[PDB]
């Protein structure tokens, strides 16, 4: 058994290990086993023929494998010759990105642009080895073939080369007459689909070996679809040094499937009631498309808003403002999110949570601060893991949830620990979600909460059907989604099968996740559609909404009382200059900011600063009071005056300016000192009441509507004031923001 090299005695050559590639310029990633073997195969084939076909299944790293082949033959025999990459238009971005992320030493030039860029790139014909990889689409190369037929190309790389399966293709006939040393084809689909196309690619590879006239003979020698081992070994040995295909199943070191699971939830009584209310809001008056094209857009916006949570609208929240167990119960989506986050904490999975709606971001933040979970944010200003709650949370102090937004996802963060993603607010296009989820890796589990038989159902089913229209390439009806027969019970249909179905969806490992029925639906490359069959309920509800002695003494007593009040008011007036500024009856985005409210620069012009005090506070404490002291010391003296003379009570605010502004004399930093604390200072006791803050907000909104100036408020934190801070933010929105006043809340 000495006959090892019985195949013409050809030597075993060598193996290109990963350290060799890393030394030769590779920087990007650590390749996998089969990827390293494929790079070895590409090198061995470059040495001993004119081209080959790397037919790995799509998504296995063919692009980075060709980049690694470049790194090899650039740092093994110093082949600085031009590498011409021809790709489809959609993947030129990926090619240009990976060429600079994996092979930064190799200068990559993209021959793209118009006729102006045609001439400006004819300018850079210096051929000084200032361009190592020329990347181009198919069409720009096809048109500008005159300039692209005058280079000693050592490597040509045709990505997704199934466009060359027709041997009479114009680009095939153009590329056949090029000066290429090694022609490499990249092909995702099974080239064995038809022997004609396989032989076409082979003839493009080796035009003299696989001659065209032999096509017929070829197809007659392998017409058999049966195995026929005695004749199958022939084809296998022939195609061995030319083709290399590996199925995804053949790779155990493949990245975990990151199974995207669409999970189903119900509704709430408030949700269904407001859904059928906002469907009957404007009654869809217009006939076809004159206003339905935009009215239905607004309607769908509000519908997905209600499905997320009804508290998005201004008037849905109850007048008593305090968080409780109703946030979870006022929305089946948030209830499912609660149970899912509980299961994730039980399994120990740190999770991401995106948001197209930033008000949904605020409400998710409030929920996290309620149930005690550590988190960050995306923009604006965060206080959960800042402010004074950062020292202790009911959840683990290390971050457990991340809060993100799709539009503001370009800020740049590192989230290596995240192995779970939740898409509560599903975008109508998942193209944004791809770059959203790219941050998880750079055993993941992507989850999307959507309510059953709702608008989100069609939105995502249409999104998935459109996402499948990429490789192998109305609004009324879609909006309607007539399944209301299921929501005709007017109940909530609160999901509770999920308490067991969640454990039945994933058996979590001790530290990471470990591997289409009732609620779970696994997206495993399949077609999914809906047809909204039961629209008769829609028509029915449409028709249904289309149907629609002692008082004499009281008077004398009140006359005497008002006379006494007149006398005492005149006494107070002529005592000294003692007066109020706000009176009861006299006639949309809460963007946060970082800094100190004493320096308000929001929109320049006028600036109304707001503060909260109690009767006879005068000089004390520090913080914002000290800061405004530093700002001309106006409130100290003005208050001191007002407190000398007993000139305030629950409510009411004094207005007054500080220093001066030379940029614009019309703009001044206005101030405000609200009185909301308890007037139990007779026995030098204190406490805070919140009911007076409501009328204080009323009167300051009146004043800010009269003067139309920017309003600026403090954090109002640094104590056990979460109830009033929740209610106070919501009341600031109710009275200032949601009533058309530029409000700004200052942090840090």
């Amino acid at each position, epitope marked *: 058994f000495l006959l090892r090299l019985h195949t013409e005695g050809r030597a075993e050559a060598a193996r290109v290990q990963e350290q060799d590639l890393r030394q030769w310029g590779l920087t990007g990633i650590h390749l996998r086993s089969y990827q390293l073997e494929g790079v070895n195969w590409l090198a061995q084939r470059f040495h001993c023929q004119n081209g080959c076909i790397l037919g790995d299944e799509m998504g296995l790293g063919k692009t980075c494998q060709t980049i690694a082949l470049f790194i090899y033959l650039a740092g093994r025999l110093n082949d600085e010759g031009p590498f011409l990459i021809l790709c489809p238009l959609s993947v030129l971005s990926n090619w240009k990105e990976e060429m600079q992320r994996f092979a930064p030493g190799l200068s990559c030039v*993209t021959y*793209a642009g118009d*006729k102006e*860029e045609r001439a400006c790139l004819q300018q850079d014909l210096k051929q000084e080895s200032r361009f190592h990889v020329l990347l181009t689409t198919y069409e*720009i190369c096809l048109k500008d073939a005159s300039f692209l037929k005058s280079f000693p190309w050592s490597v040509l790389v045709v990505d997704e080369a199934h466009r060359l399966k027709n041997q009479s293709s114009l680009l095939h006939k153009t590329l056949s007459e090029f000066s290429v040393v090694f022609s490499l084809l990249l092909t995702g689909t099974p080239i064995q689909n038809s022997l004609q196309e396989l032989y076409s690619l082979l003839s493009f590879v080796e035009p003299d070996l696989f001659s065209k006239e032999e096509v017929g003979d070829f197809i007659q020698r392998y017409q058999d679809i049966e195995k026929e081992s005695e004749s199958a070994s022939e084809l296998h040995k022939l195609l061995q040094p030319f083709l290399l295909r590996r199925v995804k199943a053949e790779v155990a070191t493949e990245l975990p499937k990151k199974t995207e699971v669409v999970i189903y939830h119900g509704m709430s009584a408030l949700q269904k009631k407001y859904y059928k209310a906002i469907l009957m809001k404007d009654l869809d008056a217009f006939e076809n498309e004159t206003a339905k094209k935009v009215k239905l857009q607004n309607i769908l916006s509000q519908l997905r808003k209600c499905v997320d949570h009804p508290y998005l609208f201004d008037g849905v929240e109850p007048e008593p403002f305090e968080v409780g167990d109703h946030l979870t119960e006022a929305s089946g989506k948030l209830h499912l999110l609660d149970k899912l986050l509980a299961f994730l904490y039980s399994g120990g999975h740190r999770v991401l949570l995106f948001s197209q709606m930033t008000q949904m971001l605020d409400i998710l933040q409030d929920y996290m601060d309620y149930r005690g979970y550590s988190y960050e944010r995306v923009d604006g200003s965060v206080r959960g893991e800042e402010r004074h709650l950062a020292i202790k949370n009911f959840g683990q102090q290390p971050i457990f949830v991340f809060l993100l937004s*799709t539009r503001a996802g370009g800020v740049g963060m590192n989230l290596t620990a995240a192995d779970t993603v939740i898409f509560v607010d599903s975008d109508f296009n998942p193209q*944004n979600d791809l770059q959203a989820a790219a941050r998880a890796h750079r055993s993941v589990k992507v989850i999307r909460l959507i309510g059953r038989d709702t608008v989100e159902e069609i939105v995502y089913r249409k999104a998935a059907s459109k996402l499948q229209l990429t490789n192998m390439i109305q609004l009324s009806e879609i909006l309607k989604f007539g399944l209301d027969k299921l929501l005709a019970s007017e109940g909530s249909t609160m999901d509770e099968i999920d308490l067991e179905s969640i454990l039945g969806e994933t058996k979590d490992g001790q530290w990471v996740s470990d591997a289409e029925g009732k609620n779970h639906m696994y997206l495993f490359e399949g077609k999914d559609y809906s047809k909204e069959p039961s629209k008769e309920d829609r028509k029915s509800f449409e028709q249904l909404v289309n149907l629609q002695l002692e008082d004499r003494q009281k008077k004398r007593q009140e006359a005497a009382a008002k006379r006494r009040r007149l006398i005492e008011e005149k006494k107070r007036q002529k005592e000294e200059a003692e007066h109020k500024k706000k009176m009861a009856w006299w006639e949309t985005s809460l963007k946060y900011v970082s800094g100190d409210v004493t320096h308000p620069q929001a929109g320049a012009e006028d600036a109304l600063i707001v503060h909260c005090v109690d009767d006879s506070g005068h000089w004390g404490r520090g913080g914002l009071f000290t800061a405004l002291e530093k700002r001309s010391a106006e409130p100290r003296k003005i208050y001191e005056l007002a407190g000398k003379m007993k000139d305030l009570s629950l409510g009411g605010v004094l207005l007054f300016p500080v220093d001066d502004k030379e940029s614009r004399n019309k703009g001044q930093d206005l101030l405000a000192l609200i009185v909301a604390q308890h007037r139990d200072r007779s026995n030098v006791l204190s406490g805070i009441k919140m009911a007076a803050l409501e009328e204080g907000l009323k009167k300051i909104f009146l004043a800010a509507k009269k003067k139309k100036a920017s309003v600026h408020l403090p954090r109002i934190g640094h104590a056990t004031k979460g109830f009033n801070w929740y209610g106070t933010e919501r009341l600031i929105r109710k009275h200032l923001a949601a009533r058309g006043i530029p409000t700004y809340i200052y942090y840090f």
Partner: single-chain antibody
Amino acid sequence: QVQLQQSGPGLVRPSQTLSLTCAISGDSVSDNDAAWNWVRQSPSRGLEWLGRTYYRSKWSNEYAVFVQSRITINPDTSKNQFSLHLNSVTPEDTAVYYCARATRPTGNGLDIWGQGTMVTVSYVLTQPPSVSVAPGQTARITCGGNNIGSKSVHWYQQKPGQAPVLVVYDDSDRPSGIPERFSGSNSGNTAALTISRVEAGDEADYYCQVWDSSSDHVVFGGGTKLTVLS
């Protein structure tokens, strides 16, 4: 595909500063093969190019002479967005504003467009303002320029209320998804768009656009409204 969403006030008072921020999702702001353009549209003033900003080893802003004295387009790499600012806005600026991306692999032909924000307050190329056609027949839209063969034409189709959609780029190259019946042509001082087997869904406005390199700015066409006879 990339997404270019936009936010701003759809109700700017006179003598104010119109600010409009377009955020990018799916691509980087400093893309070496991209240039980010602001373009407005109105039935009166037509479809005018406002400005653009690009990055070719040096951030370069290029504004139109119409508002060269009262415009400012600023990038933001941190937020991955671009902001447009217009000073002393007149009622003539009441229009619908879009952000687009000129991509070099497509001959900077404005592949993907925005959604449109309705703000309420040096090169000739002609188009036929109105072209009819019958179903099954073939329609031809002529973009008559001055030696337009020495430039790259870009044909867009805009539906009523919809954003402009690039139909052909670099004279005749067609982006994926567009049916093969739409064919581009360019020769001498005449470009053309040919629609074979005109269906009912082809009735829309059709614009041709090029880039004047002498005065260095984008120039659009007057427009062509296609009429099908269903």
